[PDB]
Design a protein around this ligand. Sequence first.
Ligand SMILES: *C[C@H](F)C(=O)N1CCN(c2nc(OC[C@@H]3CCCN3C)nc3c2CCN(c2cccc4cccc(Cl)c24)C3)C[C@@H]1CC#N
Ligand SMILES: Nc1nc2c(ncn2[C@@H]2O[C@H](COP(=O)(O)OP(=O)(O)O)[C@@H](O)[C@H]2O)c(=O)[nH]1
Ligand SMILES: [Mg+2]
Length: 169
Amino acid sequence: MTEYKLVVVGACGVGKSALTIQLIQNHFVDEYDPTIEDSYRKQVVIDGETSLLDILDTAGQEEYSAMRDQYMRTGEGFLLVFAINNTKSFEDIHHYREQIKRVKDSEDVPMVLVGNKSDLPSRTVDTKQAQDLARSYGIPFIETSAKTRQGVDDAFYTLVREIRKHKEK
Ligand SMILES: *C[C@H](F)C(=O)N1CCN(c2nc(OC[C@@H]3CCCN3C)nc3c2CCN(c2cccc4cccc(Cl)c24)C3)C[C@@H]1CC#N
Ligand SMILES: Nc1nc2c(ncn2[C@@H]2O[C@H](COP(=O)(O)OP(=O)(O)O)[C@@H](O)[C@H]2O)c(=O)[nH]1
Ligand SMILES: [Mg+2]
């Protein structure tokens, strides 16, 4: 049975954990320890294809040990998450993009740009600017709310499709 290793990255507080739990369990967790990094597994049906998602919810600390690279390098695809009400989280996307390129040693890594917290009326990041960034990278852009589940299937299933597309090549 097919296993896809997904990795969720992005600034503290963007909603990595809430997005992951929303995908795996179908509810919103508004308080999950910000330091806690863990893998979540779920059997899914995408485009009629049965598979196992193994999703790393990144946290811990910013460090570049051999061991941290090895672990991130096992990811087949990455969700680059920012929050639509946090400009800095949006600017930080380039950092994560660059680290993924470095550890996979490739310009062609399956990635999806995720603008989370789409339910909030305190937007600081233009959807236009977001789309232009995803376009500059050659990757899909999905607006999400972990709170309302808006876009959550779309974000994870899109990334699986990007991985399948990479695995065919
Ligand atoms: C809030 C909670 F602690 C959290 O989610 N964290 C802490 C930060 N951490 C992290 N942070 C950065 O950068 C943070 C800012 C942005 C620009 C540079 N700094 C100032 N970068 C990373 C990580 C986790 C470890 N990451 C890493 C390390 C080696 C290889 C590699 C390969 C691909 C992708 C990554 Cl993220 C890699 C770099 C983690 C987490 C925030 C997240 N995600
Ligand atoms: N309104 C709203 N709040 C969210 C959403 N996703 C996460 N949050 C909140 O944002 C904060 C950080 O979420 P968390 O999942 O811990 O972020 P992480 O550090 O990237 O794991 C918490 O207070 C969450 O309740 C969302 O889609 N909408
Ligand atoms: Mg978290």
